[PDB]
Design an enzyme around this catalytic site. Sequence first.
Site, PDB file in Angstrom:
ATOM      1  N   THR A  16       8.613  13.678  -0.045  1.00 25.20           N
ATOM      2  CA  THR A  16       8.528  14.975   0.752  1.00 25.20           C
ATOM      3  C   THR A  16       9.700  15.874  -0.006  1.00 25.20           C
ATOM      4  O   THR A  16       9.559  17.042   0.402  1.00 25.20           O
ATOM      5  CB  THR A  16       8.617  14.653   2.002  1.00 25.20           C
ATOM      6  OG1 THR A  16       9.782  13.985   2.512  1.00 25.20           O
ATOM      7  CG2 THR A  16       7.367  14.357   2.807  1.00 25.20           C
ATOM      8  N   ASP A  39      -9.939  14.557 -23.988  1.00 20.15           N
ATOM      9  CA  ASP A  39      -8.850  14.734 -24.618  1.00 20.15           C
ATOM     10  C   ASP A  39      -8.964  14.338 -26.370  1.00 20.15           C
ATOM     11  O   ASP A  39     -10.037  14.487 -27.152  1.00 20.15           O
ATOM     12  CB  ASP A  39      -7.622  13.932 -24.156  1.00 20.15           C
ATOM     13  CG  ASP A  39      -6.504  15.147 -23.965  1.00 20.15           C
ATOM     14  OD1 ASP A  39      -6.010  15.539 -25.241  1.00 20.15           O
ATOM     15  OD2 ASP A  39      -6.163  15.773 -22.862  1.00 20.15           O
ATOM     16  N   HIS A  69      -1.671  13.773 -27.339  1.00 18.88           N
ATOM     17  CA  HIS A  69      -1.660  14.389 -26.327  1.00 18.88           C
ATOM     18  C   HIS A  69      -2.324  13.522 -25.414  1.00 18.88           C
ATOM     19  O   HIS A  69      -2.138  13.367 -24.380  1.00 18.88           O
ATOM     20  CB  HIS A  69      -2.249  15.731 -26.504  1.00 18.88           C
ATOM     21  CG  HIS A  69      -2.334  16.581 -25.480  1.00 18.88           C
ATOM     22  ND1 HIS A  69      -3.881  16.750 -24.829  1.00 18.88           N
ATOM     23  CD2 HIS A  69      -1.766  17.141 -24.550  1.00 18.88           C
ATOM     24  CE1 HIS A  69      -3.869  17.554 -23.739  1.00 18.88           C
ATOM     25  NE2 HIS A  69      -2.543  17.784 -23.580  1.00 18.88           N
ATOM     26  N   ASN A 161      -1.678  27.215 -19.579  1.00 17.21           N
ATOM     27  CA  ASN A 161      -0.318  27.282 -19.869  1.00 17.21           C
ATOM     28  C   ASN A 161      -0.162  28.906 -20.443  1.00 17.21           C
ATOM     29  O   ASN A 161       0.680  29.182 -21.272  1.00 17.21           O
ATOM     30  CB  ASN A 161       0.122  26.606 -20.858  1.00 17.21           C
ATOM     31  CG  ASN A 161      -0.012  25.109 -20.675  1.00 17.21           C
ATOM     32  OD1 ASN A 161      -0.120  24.794 -19.383  1.00 17.21           O
ATOM     33  ND2 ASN A 161      -0.288  24.077 -21.670  1.00 17.21           N
ATOM     34  N   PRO A 175     -15.189  26.800  -9.635  1.00 17.21           N
ATOM     35  CA  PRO A 175     -14.763  26.521  -8.225  1.00 17.21           C
ATOM     36  C   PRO A 175     -14.803  24.969  -7.598  1.00 17.21           C
ATOM     37  O   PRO A 175     -14.315  24.625  -6.773  1.00 17.21           O
ATOM     38  CB  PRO A 175     -15.635  27.436  -7.381  1.00 17.21           C
ATOM     39  CG  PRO A 175     -16.135  28.386  -8.509  1.00 17.21           C
ATOM     40  CD  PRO A 175     -16.209  27.633  -9.710  1.00 17.21           C
ATOM     41  N   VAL A 177     -14.631  22.156  -9.112  1.00 14.44           N
ATOM     42  CA  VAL A 177     -13.821  21.014  -9.884  1.00 14.44           C
ATOM     43  C   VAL A 177     -12.294  21.262  -9.237  1.00 14.44           C
ATOM     44  O   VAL A 177     -12.053  22.490  -8.718  1.00 14.44           O
ATOM     45  CB  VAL A 177     -13.804  21.048 -11.071  1.00 14.44           C
ATOM     46  CG1 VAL A 177     -15.212  20.846 -11.700  1.00 14.44           C
ATOM     47  CG2 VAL A 177     -13.220  22.368 -11.845  1.00 14.44           C
ATOM     48  N   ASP A 200      -6.217  24.888  -6.896  1.00 15.63           N
ATOM     49  CA  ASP A 200      -6.275  23.931  -5.612  1.00 15.63           C
ATOM     50  C   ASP A 200      -5.269  23.161  -5.372  1.00 15.63           C
ATOM     51  O   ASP A 200      -4.956  22.960  -4.230  1.00 15.63           O
ATOM     52  CB  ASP A 200      -7.569  22.997  -5.784  1.00 15.63           C
ATOM     53  CG  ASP A 200      -8.883  23.566  -6.336  1.00 15.63           C
ATOM     54  OD1 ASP A 200      -9.399  24.540  -5.680  1.00 15.63           O
ATOM     55  OD2 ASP A 200      -9.369  23.537  -7.370  1.00 15.63           O
ATOM     56  N   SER A 224      -1.363  20.549 -18.766  1.00 16.09           N
ATOM     57  CA  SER A 224      -1.966  19.224 -19.373  1.00 16.09           C
ATOM     58  C   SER A 224      -1.235  17.917 -18.634  1.00 16.09           C
ATOM     59  O   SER A 224      -1.843  16.843 -18.547  1.00 16.09           O
ATOM     60  CB  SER A 224      -1.853  19.328 -20.840  1.00 16.09           C
ATOM     61  OG  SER A 224      -3.213  19.905 -21.292  1.00 16.09           O
ATOM     62  N   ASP A 260       6.356  24.328  -0.146  1.00 16.00           N
ATOM     63  CA  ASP A 260       7.576  23.790  -0.887  1.00 16.00           C
ATOM     64  C   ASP A 260       7.978  24.246  -2.375  1.00 16.00           C
ATOM     65  O   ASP A 260       8.923  24.050  -2.731  1.00 16.00           O
ATOM     66  CB  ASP A 260       7.487  22.423  -1.001  1.00 16.00           C
ATOM     67  CG  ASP A 260       7.510  21.490   0.210  1.00 16.00           C
ATOM     68  OD1 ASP A 260       8.044  22.194   1.348  1.00 16.00           O
ATOM     69  OD2 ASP A 260       7.356  20.450   0.378  1.00 16.00           O
TER      70      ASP A 260
END
Length: 279
Positions: A16, A39, A69, A161, A175, A177, A200, A224, A260
Amino acid sequence: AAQTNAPWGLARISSTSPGTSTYYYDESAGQGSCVYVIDTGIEASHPEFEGRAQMVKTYYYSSRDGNGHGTHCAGTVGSRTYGVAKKTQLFGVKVLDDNGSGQYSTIIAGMDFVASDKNNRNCPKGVVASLSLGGGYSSSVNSAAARLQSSGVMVAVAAGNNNADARNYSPASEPSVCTVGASDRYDRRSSFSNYGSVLDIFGPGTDILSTWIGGSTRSISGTSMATPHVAGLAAYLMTLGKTTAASACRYIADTANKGDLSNIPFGTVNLLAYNNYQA
């Protein structure tokens, strides 16, 4: 279970407050679930995967990860040391060439492959797809991602990024996903992280230590890197029975550390992936 001296992102999503070093998690660890890593490939021979990884598809002359990657992402999903779901099954779909690029047509093909191929695989606790990739907006790429989600896979995609609004990037802007921003070890938005109402959830994405090709390891940054934290968490919660593929993204948002993060632009969620494990 407890992983002492875990990487900071693993510790982050089981705490937390920032600044901890142990990753608490239920010992089922995502057994019985499958995560597709769409990927550059996965170096399945890496000891960190313990033979729990296998390539299942490639659109290039090789199925191997000549970039690193995909391996880094697959390691964050389910590697024994750097991964969220330590017992999960990892499938490799190589839609990106060894420079990290791929055409949308190839990426679309990859997603439709996953939606069908999961019917070849024993994933009784459910199926996840991690998509650490993207580019400029395309509806075809968005529908591809929404199809995959509809077929019964928890789809997690990187927000991008560009330090810009994700609504101009795909599949980030779809929207239906789960679109993942990136944060750092001090609960700051990563300087590169895209933002926007289409996000999200945030996941750790600055200085993330994970597997690399040549059976090695390295620390890199990107949304990523955050995306597979959420993909892995998804598989972890689906193994536990706490959610379904169709419900996992909203559930992770229902159960996140709220408010947070710092440098969240107005209109973007302040939600940080969290497994609420009570040892």
